[PDB]
Amino acid sequence: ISRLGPDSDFLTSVVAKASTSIVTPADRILVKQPLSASSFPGTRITGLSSYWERYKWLSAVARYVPAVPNTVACQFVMYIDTDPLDDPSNISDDNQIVRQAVSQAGSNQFNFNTSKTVPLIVRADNQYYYTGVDKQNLRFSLQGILYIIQVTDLINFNGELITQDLTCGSLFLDWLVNFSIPQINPTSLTDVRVDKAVNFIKPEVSGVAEIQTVTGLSPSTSYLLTPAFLEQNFQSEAGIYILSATPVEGEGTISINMDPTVTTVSGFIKVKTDTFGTFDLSVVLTTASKKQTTGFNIIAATS
Amino acid sequence: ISRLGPDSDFLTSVVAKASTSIVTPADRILVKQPLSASSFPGTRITGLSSYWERYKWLSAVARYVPAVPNTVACQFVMYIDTDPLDDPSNISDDNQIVRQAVSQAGSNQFNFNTSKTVPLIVRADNQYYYTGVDKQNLRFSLQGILYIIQVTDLINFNGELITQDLTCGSLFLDWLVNFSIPQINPTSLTDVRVDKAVNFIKPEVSGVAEIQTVTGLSPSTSYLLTPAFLEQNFQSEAGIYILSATPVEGEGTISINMDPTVTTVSGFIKVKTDTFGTFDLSVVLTTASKKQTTGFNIIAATS
Amino acid sequence: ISRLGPDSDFLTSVVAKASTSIVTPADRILVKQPLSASSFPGTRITGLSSYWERYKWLSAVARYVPAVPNTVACQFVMYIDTDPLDDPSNISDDNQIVRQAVSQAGSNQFNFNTSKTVPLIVRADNQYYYTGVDKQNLRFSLQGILYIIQVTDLINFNGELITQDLTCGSLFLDWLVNFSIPQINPTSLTDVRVDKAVNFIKPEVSGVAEIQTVTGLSPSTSYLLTPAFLEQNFQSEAGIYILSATPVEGEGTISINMDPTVTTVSGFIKVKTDTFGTFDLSVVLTTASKKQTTGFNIIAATS
Amino acid sequence: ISRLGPDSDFLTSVVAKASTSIVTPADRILVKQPLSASSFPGTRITGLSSYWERYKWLSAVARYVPAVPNTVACQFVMYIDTDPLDDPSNISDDNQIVRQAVSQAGSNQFNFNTSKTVPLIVRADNQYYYTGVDKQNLRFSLQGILYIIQVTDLINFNGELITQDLTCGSLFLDWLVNFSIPQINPTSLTDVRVDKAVNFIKPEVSGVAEIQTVTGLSPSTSYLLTPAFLEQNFQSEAGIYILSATPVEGEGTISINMDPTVTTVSGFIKVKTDTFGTFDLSVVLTTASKKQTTGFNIIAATS
Amino acid sequence: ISRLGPDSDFLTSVVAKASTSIVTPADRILVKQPLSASSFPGTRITGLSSYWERYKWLSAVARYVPAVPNTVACQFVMYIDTDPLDDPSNISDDNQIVRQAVSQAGSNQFNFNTSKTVPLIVRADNQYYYTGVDKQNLRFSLQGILYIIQVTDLINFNGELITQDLTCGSLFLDWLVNFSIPQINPTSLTDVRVDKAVNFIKPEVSGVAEIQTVTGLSPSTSYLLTPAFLEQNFQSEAGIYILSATPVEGEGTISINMDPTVTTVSGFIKVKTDTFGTFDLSVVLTTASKKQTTGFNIIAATS
Amino acid sequence: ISRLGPDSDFLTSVVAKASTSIVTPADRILVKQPLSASSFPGTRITGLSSYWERYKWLSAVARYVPAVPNTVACQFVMYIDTDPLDDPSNISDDNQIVRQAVSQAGSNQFNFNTSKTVPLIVRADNQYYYTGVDKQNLRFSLQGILYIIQVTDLINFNGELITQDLTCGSLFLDWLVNFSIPQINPTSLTDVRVDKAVNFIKPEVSGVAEIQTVTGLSPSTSYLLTPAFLEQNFQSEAGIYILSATPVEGEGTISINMDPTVTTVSGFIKVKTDTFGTFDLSVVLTTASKKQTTGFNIIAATS
């Protein structure tokens, strides 16, 4: 078994809600964060969790630090329920949901402008849980679920109720794990993202290619270029709008043909930047008399 | 320091080239594979290498297994040059490039239908190299570069020359590392990929949405949907082609407006599958009398 | 090796910026301070670092103390990236830049009115870095770069956004180093400074020298006197403006000749003060009938 | 206490004077060098001495090496008087000043073409002396004063008197100190220096700026630019001489206005070089028809 | 690691320059010799350094022995700067460049007719430097650079200035290294040299070959013969100048055809000598009536 | 004594000859390779052997690896005769030469498609042999001579005779030596080589020099440039062919003067490349109207 840690990991922010925004006792739950190893998308532990099969938090002490002044006050209670199918979201009594919160071991009751810690209590046996995204049963792959309950109305410096929502802190983990059995573990968790939208150049000479240089991107990362344009009237003048762009080093072609007899808006470009964060592509137009702009999107895997 | 391993990693295939395809002594180099921790895109070690700053192969024994029968023969030589700026690609003598290959320590000389191993010789000091993609100088972040040289013409069962290229084996690592100083290490290495191209449905009723169910994808992975169509004549009949698709659960919109007065082909959809590998989206057309098909691409981060 | 410390060193102030002043995720970086031994110009460690070749922070724990009351609140995160070419200034996601901040080892997450410390994590080998100003590669001479990221909008006592910039604290180091190999290490870091601008006296008698005594300077420090005057009409009356000043003890002459046939405004004076912080110079004018004032600047090396 | 050393330090040269140049017995003293830690301006020890309060030479053995051949001869005597207010410069007998020199402990009597050493004798108590420039009393901050006396007329290869002064050797220290109580110790000892004098370019176009590139300076050091010109007749042709120079990166402006109605010759420029030792500044002239040259001085702190 | 030494190696001679030949303080540097293992072309250590990747001088004490009498005198200072990018060639003060020389550890100050030694101070870590010719950064492959500064004007037996340059000594190393990781290390350092120029014989009989025996060469070394002739008028008589020379044992042909219709002056001969230092070649002329001499050059790799 | 190894060294290839190509029993000897330390020109050991006087193989196990398939068969026998003047090349019986081969100790009898090793048996005394090229007697400087004898006709997959020669394997050493008494050992073994033949440019302007840039050479290696041209008719038009080329940095001149009154084709150029493998030279022609091409050869020491 490969023992890793201790490090930190950013889970979420927590939005303490106003006294008028709480209607049912199920509405008091501010965060419901699973503490599986594969449920913090983008952090250090979730990128590591898809390279072993099993894991076990030896000590995953959740750590709250506030972002709120010392002139507003509200009491929280914070626990880690080790039974991932027990659910406090269907308890109809507001005093019952907070007796259920303090009764859980390791719970810790704080004013929400104070840094306090909640440790995860390990199970008496040497039980390993599966990593990765969740299959059929949650009890194979979640060791705990982190809750925060609001027990008091959000008060201010004069004894009055704050009537607006207020993002109040951040939850940081401090983990220590035993991974085991290295498997590259498919159904990856890297979510792609539209990085930015930047348009092509407007060339002068018909049929002669030009080099367009885009700047301000990450150094030496592979991107994916998809064409998409917004609200262009290609029939405001004569000619056929034909745009074909290729990378000078990468792979793929983009064909933009706004001929209404045969219309083709397709293609993709795979190209990585240089060490400065730039890449260049050759754009050629058969009819350069048309000056309608055309954009393209930058798709990248961020985590 | 976190000691990891031992495991295996698939580097490349190796294409043993014919006797007529070798012209200069620089052409004998079959593979030039850097043995940095961040230069095997998609494997286990490269996914792990961007979560620590430094690394050191305590034992990275490269292991060749063949995929060629016992009736063709060719002698290889295989070494790991620990000086990543020394380059054998500019040596003009064919006998010099193979005396330079056997003189390197840890080199191993095999017939190419035989499984033989080449160990990486560590440096006498306790020197750590940086992970991640390479910056200015290669000697900060490459511990070795793996070469394979072809020293004999590719012969067959009767003593004659094979005149075609022949993929012959595969290179597997057996690594053992000391990582250190956990940093999430930006400029990620996850390259995105066009997964498959599948088109929208052809609905019957104008203005009433329908649910399109795409199957055969990975379970519980986040995708990115980009619109692109190929060679459609939207002016073969009357009407305005307006297609708007939204996910029922995810995020984003796709607008396909083939009005030649204002043309908008844009948008993206972020949506993840269910546990069966399917996801569904609501497609509505204002004018359903037009039966031109429209496609969309599936962008996903694969590693 | 000469082991020095522990002492303190003033790095910078940190200007926590308002919620409207943050546009891109790269704008959240408040300070980007290199923690090389030669990158704190004027402190104790940078004056010492140019008298040895190498250094290694055994413990350089950065220490934040606030200068802001307990009625405004904002959460910081603070880390020391040991890889001086990894750059978080080109990450396009605001949640990614703060997961990258907490994942770094030794990071520490605080409300910005609270004194918290961030230790520098040493590298597993015994690696020495060069001192002095940076040459070609930064990884030879920077052991870490200190960042501070703002993760929460700057809030006040009532839950409202502060709309102005607010200098909030100060960063103090607590260092402990092993220097080695004494070299006086050229390209010094002492920046000169215009100390103050004070003008000459207006003497009465032509051709007879007078002693001008300037007060209020540092005791027993060598200065440099350069002549410069502002907006004088020397042709408002007759005569030739000739001013020649020499120190009574130091070195150099200043010649001020406003003859429009041959104009000479040049010279410098090197003279040090006495133990009281004063020095005196002999000023003689050939034509004292002209009462245009003439100034001179005081150049001094401050650190 | 921080124990430093052993290293070397260049004190001075020593000019052995001729037999006709010695008139009084006080004239035999060749060098009178204080051996305080802050009295060798520019060396290694004086740059280090202003970063602690106290010091004590455990062994500061002064070391003479000659620069004179073996064909001229003269006997020296060399001692270190530990009482910095005892003065041998007011002893009227030439035989008394050399009995006073050999009687001092640690004195060493050599021919002046021979390398001999003089050790500093420490005081029987554990007495620390203050660093920095000298205040009221010298006995708080000087541990010794180094003398060299000439006891014999300067003779040559044939037994005749050399009648000219002759620089003969150099004095090198070999020190070993205990510093204590780190204080950054104001009234710094870095003396500024006119580096070189270089003039502006003569531009062609009026009102359009040009870039002047000065080369041959130290890499990555901050300078100070002061304007000063020598003997220019600005009324040899028509026009108003207006020169305004700014750095492209640094700080400050220089205004040169030779209008005799309002004359302004002022300003300073703070700018540092690049890694090649060059810096560039933008020079613009309102009236470029005047071709009088104008210079500027380069002020830099050298030690 | 293979520990080698101790042996000696001849670095250079050193030309002490006259008092009139020193203009700038950068001109005082007599030698600037890098002390890399691959920067003494022709010695023992540089021939050995291209057969391992790394090296570390455990003790490389530079040793000066003079070649000048005891009747001229000049003081040197000699140090080994361990930071190969620190450069004293851009320091504008002549007293600063010699305080920077004595402050370096291991420096040693001698009269230049005296044998003195300068040891190389090793770095506190176990750092190995690359061998071979220098790549991008010098700090990977130079452990030190050897300087010698002239601090005193070159004086003679009577106290007068020598006005001519004077080669004065020689610098010998005394090394002790740890090499590691045997690699044959391309881009070899063996520089070829025109050994001597000797011409062909003038044969009598047309079309009958003769044996030309060249003597006075190195025994059993492979040479390379290239044809080149100087100022021959081949049209002073009738006939066609055709000369073809082959070795009797070696490889290659030389064709000398001075036909102005088709002119061919080409070819090379590879042939090694016998154990006596001679080799013989067959020279045949089709038209022996022409008595113009023709030469050939002897190319050999000397180190 | 300096103990080196163990490493590998490429000796030769071995050409197994057909059944019809064997006539006399002396023709069965495939390789006759001396195992002196100075008889593998270009390898690691021969470059090291000319830097000590003596050597002794403690273990020089010769290692055969085949390059032939498993469908042809032939039996070899392989031994190392420690008596370098005993010669099996004058034994008239084919069965005697193979009884003499197996009787030698350390001999090893293999099918020629199988990797087998032959160890060198050391002599019972501690006898050192001289390095370098061989003088008068071979028994001072050869410890062994490696033979391979073919004992069986070369057969194929069906029991028939292969009638063509077939290069079959390669011989690799695995050495371990004690060198002694460091001497730089003259009559070097570096053989020079014509690298490539590339011609001059054809300039346009008479008398104005142009810069010719040759690419594709080894980085930072010193070359030697010799002029040689092939079959040029310089009298096809008017003018005098005068070509003079100099390096911009190196040493030497080439003069090409095709004046038939005084003809000079001579000169050499010594110039090294930059770090990219290129060098440039200035070519000037007095009469550029002549467009006959002229070549030059590149001489380099390869090992």
Author numbering:
A (entry chain A), B (entry chain A), C (entry chain A), D (entry chain A), E (entry chain A), F (entry chain A): 66 to 368
Published text:
A major factor that limits the expansion of shrimp cultures is, however, infectious diseases from viruses, such as P. vannamei nodavirus (PvNV) and M. rosenbergii nodavirus (MrNV), which have inflicted heavy economic losses. The Nodaviridae genome comprises two single-stranded positive-sense RNA that encode the capsid protein for viral capsid assembly, the RNA polymerase for RNA replication, and the B2 protein for host RNA interference suppressor. While the shell domains (S-domains) of PvNV and MrNV contain conserved sequences of 62% identity, the protrusion domains (P-domains) and N-arms show low sequence identities of only 17% and 43%, respectively.
The structure of a smaller-sized T = 1 PvNV-LP particle was determined by cryo-EM at 3.7 Å resolution. A structural comparison of one subunit of T = 1 PvNV-LP and the subunit A of T = 3 PvNV-LP reveals RMSD < 0.2 Å. The 30 spikes on the outer surface are also readily discernible. They might be mainly involved in the homo-dimeric capsomere interactions, resulting in the A/A dimer with a bent conformation with angle ~144°, similar to the A/B dimer of T = 3 PvNV-LP. Although there is no extra density at the interface between two neighboring subunits of the T = 1 PvNV-LP, the high structural homology of the S-domains in the T = 3 and T = 1 PvNV-LPs suggests that the Ca2+-binding site is conserved.
